[PDB]
Design a protein around this nucleic acid. Structure first.
Ligand SMILES: Nc1nc2c(ncn2[C@H]2C[C@H](O)[C@@H](COP(=O)(O)NP(=O)(O)OP(=O)(O)O)O2)c(=O)[nH]1
Ligand SMILES: [Mn+2]
Ligand SMILES: [Mn+2]
Length: 538
DNA sequence: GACCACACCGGC
DNA sequence: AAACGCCGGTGTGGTC
């Protein structure tokens, strides 16, 4: 490419180099653009951002987030990564996409701009005739990248002082647990080392091994194994408690306070758009899609996520979403009637599990039933189910039997999805998002059947992800008009932030947009709460 | 210091 | 651990 002076013409593709992967924290080291056989390198990258109409190129959203951080309303446009991801969701990195579609991902801005132009040309042509993937690109993924850019630059408020005080209380309890574990072991050791713990439990103590680890075949110390040994020795229960507290302290309580941005005073995640095999987003740096909620301590951590003063959080979450999606995809009349009657399969499975009336099912029980309902749907074995519920093997076998007997067209849909996946080489969502599963033809049964579980899960999980994305695209402009903020997406949930006096109107509107995103054979019901913290809004 | 595999476990 | 699926973060033990 011929070198030309900054600025570039309108519509040029950008390349850029960040001091680090996280756009909210990175220095903009270099900026360049390419168009019409020329490359334009910016002498002063920061000031040079003001010359761009949009961020068009590889990782476009990252540059848009950095621009918004600096007060510049630079939206992301075309991104070859999104094209590649729609053609094959194993296209997750610029390194791989470049090698695959005609370039090399380097560390120079000008070459990255030239690469973005070359890759877009080639990838755009590969989507000729792919009407459904083209619709997903233009109507979902490309506009969604702008929504996510704004969400990333906005962040969420965190009660730092609260978490600092919580850390000290948890530290004292961890001390009580480890000191007890060492007394029971007869000697201290590194309780964070699963190798050392393995030797204590199975060699020094006389506990029987239950399972082995995957890659190295060590005697497992997993929670599932410890639960099986809960009654064999009093050290086991303490280890499980130590694990819970240290997991939450090391992963949330201690690190999150240190990630508050100095200018915004809020916590900023990255919403990765080309990271999963199914079409889901992921969240990283930090991951805000796995904040605790299940245990008492976890709920205390979730309470640290708060609204700006004078505002409230609004949390919306699709009801039984993948089961509703399954009803539409499979057309099972029995499953459709379930939701047309307003029933709750999680609460009903819970009622059976704990032998109590539906009105007596608490959230803890219902959450456990959610795990059972989807575990069985996507292929959980009777053996594992019998151990999860502490019931005889024959009773777990009977539950799985009635589960599918209740919804006969589900098995039919699974078989048809797998047969089509073998012929075409891929499975697809309701909107045509595809995942290639070559191991459906594997000649090793264990491999083939693992691929089968991956394969018929994807249309269900992926359709739910398609629906959530489309709802975000529809909802975002309405929230801007209302002066509200979209903060987080957690797969089938949105967390919004609204002025207190508008919180109710925002909650009603967001609920209606999400429930009407795309009418199916069953209604899509959305549960909504409002509160000053994330837990309260649930 | 960065990076890695591994086992593991937080969420949906 | 076991024939649930999809993620990202941690400490250990180890290399470089
Ligand atoms: N395979 C699998 N999928 C899961 C699991 N947990 C969640 N998912 C998938 C399937 C779930 O549909 C989806 C969203 O998870 P939620 O919002 O926590 N539960 P839901 O929407 O079902 O019920 P309600 O909102 O009324 O409580 O994530 C699991 O253990 N396994
Ligand atoms: Mn839900
Ligand atoms: Mn949810």
């Amino acid at each position: 490419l011929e070198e030309a002076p900054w600025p570039p013409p309108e519509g040029a593709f950008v390349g850029f180099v960040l001091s680090r992967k996280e756009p909210m924290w990175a220095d903009l080291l270099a900026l360049a653009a390419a168009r019409g056989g020329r490359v334009h390198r910016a002498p002063e990258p920061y000031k040079a951002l003001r010359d761009l109409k949009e961020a068009r190129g590889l990782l476009a959203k990252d540059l848009s987030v950095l621009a918004l951080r600096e007060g510049l309303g630079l939206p992301p446009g075309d991104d070859p990564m999104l094209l590649a991801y729609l053609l094959d969701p194993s296209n997750t990195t610029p390194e791989g996409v470049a090698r695959r579609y005609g370039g090399e991902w380097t560390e120079e801005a000008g070459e990255r701009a030239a690469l973005s132009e070359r890759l877009f040309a080639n990838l755009w042509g590969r989507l000729e005739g792919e009407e459904r993937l083209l619709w997903l690109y233009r109507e979902v993924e490309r506009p969604l990248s702008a929504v996510l850019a704004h969400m990333e630059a906005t962040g969420v408020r965190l009660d730092v002082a609260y978490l600092r005080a919580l850390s000290l209380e948890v530290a004292e309890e961890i001390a009580r647990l480890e000191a007890e574990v060492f007394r029971l072991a007869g000697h201290p050791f590194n309780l964070n080392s699963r190798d050392q713990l393995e030797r204590v439990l199975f060699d020094e103590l006389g506990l029987p091994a239950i399972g082995k680890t995957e890659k190295t075949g060590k005697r497992s110390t997993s929670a599932a194994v410890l639960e099986a040994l809960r009654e064999a020795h009093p050290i086991v229960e303490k280890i499980l408690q130590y694990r819970e507290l240290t997991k939450l302290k090391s992963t949330y309580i201690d690190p999150l306070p240190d990630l508050i941005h100095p200018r915004t005073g809020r916590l900023h995640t990255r919403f990765n758009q080309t990271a999963t095999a199914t079409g889901r987003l992921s969240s990283s740096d930090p991951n805000l899609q796995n904040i605790p909620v299940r245990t008492p301590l976890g709920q205390r951590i979730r309470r640290a996520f708060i609204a700006e003063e004078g505002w409230l959080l609004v949390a919306l979450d699709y009801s039984q979403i993948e089961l509703r999606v399954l009803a539409h995809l499979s057309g099972d009349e029995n499953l459709i009637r379930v939701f047309q009657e307003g029933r709750d399969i999680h609460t009903e499975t819970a009622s059976w599990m704990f032998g109590v009336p539906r009105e007596a099912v608490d959230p803890l029980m219902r959450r456990a039933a959610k795990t059972i309902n989807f575990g069985v749907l996507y292929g959980m074995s009777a053996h594992r189910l019998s151990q999860e519920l502490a019931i005889p093997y024959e009773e777990a076998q009977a539950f799985i039997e009635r589960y599918f007997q209740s919804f006969p067209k589900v098995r039919a849909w699974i078989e048809k999805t797998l047969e089509e996946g073998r012929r075409r080489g891929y499975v697809e969502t309701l909107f045509g998002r595809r995942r290639y599963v070559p191991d459906l033809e594997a000649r090793v049964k264990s491999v083939r059947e693992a691929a089968e579980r991956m394969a018929f899960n994807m249309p269900v999980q992926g359709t739910a992800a398609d629906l959530m994305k489309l709802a975000m695209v529809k909802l975002f402009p309405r929230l801007e008009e209302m002066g509200a903020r979209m903060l987080l997406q957690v797969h089938d949930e949105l967390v919004l932030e609204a002025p207190k006096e508008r919180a109710e109107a925002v909650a009603r509107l967001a609920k209606e947009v999400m429930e009407g995103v795309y009418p199916l054979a069953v209604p899509l019901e959305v549960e909504v709460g409002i509160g000053e913290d994330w837990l309260s809004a649930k």
